[PDB]
Structure formats: C-alpha cells, structure tokens
C-alpha cells in the first residue's frame, strides 16, 4: 500500500498539472491522459485503478503480446517523459527499426 | 475567403500575433529542436530562463 513502493509513483508524479512540463505543454498532458492519468487529479486518484478490486490472470499469451504492443511498444502517442527519444527522431520502439536498422 | 481587408487595429493585431505565433496551444510545426531544449514556444523562453 506504501505510495513510495507503487510502480506508478514516478509516472503519476511526472503527470501533474503543477509540474511546468505538464501545465505549459498540452503535448505532455495529452501523453499522460492517453495512459489514463488525469494530471488535474490528486496523486492518490492518478495512481488508482478506478472501479477495479481484483486482477485475475487468464494466461493468454497472444492477448498479452497484443496489449504489450498497443500499450508499450507501439502506443498512439509517445509514452511520457520521452522528449529525448522524440528529439533523436523516435517516438516509440516500433519506429526504431522502421527509420533505422543494421 | 475571396478578399482580405485591413482594419488597422493594433491591439487586435498584438492579441492575434500572441495567440497564433508567440504563445500557441501546440508548438508551431518543425520545432522538435526548440522543444528538445525545453521550449515549445516564444512565451516559454523567458518563463524558464531569463538573464
């Protein structure tokens, strides 16, 4: 239950309207909102998985791959705090091998 | 839009230059370099660094 031990703390801390990187840049706010984090809400609700009590495993590898692809590897917008990757020409993992390869 | 007509209203001109060019909602296109250095627009330059 410790907030410091929650794997969402760094992202939910970044994704705040009180962070100049969010408040002055719609770009960054939209990246946060794309990952269900509303930067306008307190930390506790930004980290909360709403109307969800229990996580149950289904052990379905193809559904797992499908989700890892859409959420992590090829998201609609770049995952937050990635201005460095974007500046070098790569918004996401899927773009790395499309633009350059060896 | 067929014709453009001048209204010679400086304050409306300043207001529009501010919203379109200086402080737009999103960075003006082809500005990844400015954005990468921490500045999306002109308005952000003097907010984050001043001398």
Swiss-Prot record, chain A:
Glycans are attached at residue 51. It is found in: Secreted; Parasitophorous vacuole. Homotetramer. Belongs to the GDA1/CD39 NTPase family. May perform an important processing step in the conversion of high energy nucleotides prior to uptake by the parasite. NTPAse-II has a specific activity 4.5-fold lower than NTPAse-I in hydrolysis of ATP. The primary difference between these isozymes lies in their ability to hydrolyze nucleoside triphosphate versus diphosphate substrates. While NTPAse-II hydrolyzes ATP to ADP and ADP to AMP at almost the same rate, NTPAse-I hydrolyzes ADP to AMP at a much slower rate (0.7% of the rate for ATP). This is Nucleoside-triphosphatase 2. It comes from Toxoplasma gondii. The chain holds residues 382 to 483 of 628 of the full protein.
């Amino acid at each position: 239950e410790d907030v410091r031990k929650n794997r969402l703390k760094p992202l939910a801390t970044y994704c705040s309207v009180h962070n100049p990187e969010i408040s002055f840049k719609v770009t960054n706010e939209m990246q946060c909102r794309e990952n269900s984090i509303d930067p306008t809400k307190p930390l506790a609700e930004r980290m909360k998985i709403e109307n969800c009590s229990i996580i149950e495993g289904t052990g379905n590898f193809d559904k797992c791959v499908s989700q890892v692809e859409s959420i992590l590897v090829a998201p609609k917008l770049p995952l937050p705090a990635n201005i460095e990757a974007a500046s070098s020409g790569f918004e996401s993992v899927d773009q790395v091998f499309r633009f350059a390869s060896s």
